[PDB]
RNA sequence: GUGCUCGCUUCGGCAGCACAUAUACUAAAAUUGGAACGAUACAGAGAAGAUUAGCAUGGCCCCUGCGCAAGGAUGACACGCAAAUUCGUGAAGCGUU
């Protein structure tokens with residue numbers, strides 16, 4: 001059982017260290033980024049997860065499920081306007097992926 | 107500061123002229139922080155039984171070396187509920203239109 005936010009920050013320190021270490025070794029391996037971003041979105045620290053998805057798109061911009069997870073985080077967390085920007089950037093960079101257009105018009 | 111001054115003009119002072127033209131991380135300091143690989147306790151070599159030569163791979167880990175040699179335990183690390191977009195069959199019971 002964790003008490004006041006010193007111990008919560010210690011938990012977060014351990015988890016962030018674990019994920020950043022997995023990112024250091026694998027470097028690519030897109031699931032590592034997705035797990036770390038899902039963990040950040042579960043704790044409503046979604047600016048961290050914006051950073052993680054943007055770093056993952058710096059690694060691999062052509063991976064379509066990564067764009068999908070980033071945009072579904074921003075849709076899910078009621079950030080209509082961020083997600084809308086993401087879909088515009090997604091359909092601009094990867095225009096022959098029809099997934100992006102269907103989900104944005106939906 | 108020196109010298110020339112047919113300068114006042116004594117050998118005292120002054121006047122003019124010429125030449126000479128810009129050092130310094132400005133400290134004898136006040137401060138300000140970070141390191142060592144030594145002890146002192148816990149700790150003990152990778153490869154699916156045991157004993158083990160090693161050569162790599164990658165980087166927000168470096169050390170010895172002049173080294174684009176070669177060593178450092180194969181120098182160490184690496185050991186992970188390793189789940190990424192995206193579903194459907196058939197029968198039975200209950201309630202509903």
Ligand SMILES: [Mg+2]
Nearest residue numbers: 176177180181
């Ligand atoms: Mg060697």
Ligand SMILES: [Mg+2]
Nearest residue numbers: 159160179180
């Ligand atoms: Mg050996």
Ligand SMILES: [Mg+2]
Nearest residue numbers: 162180181182
């Ligand atoms: Mg090695």
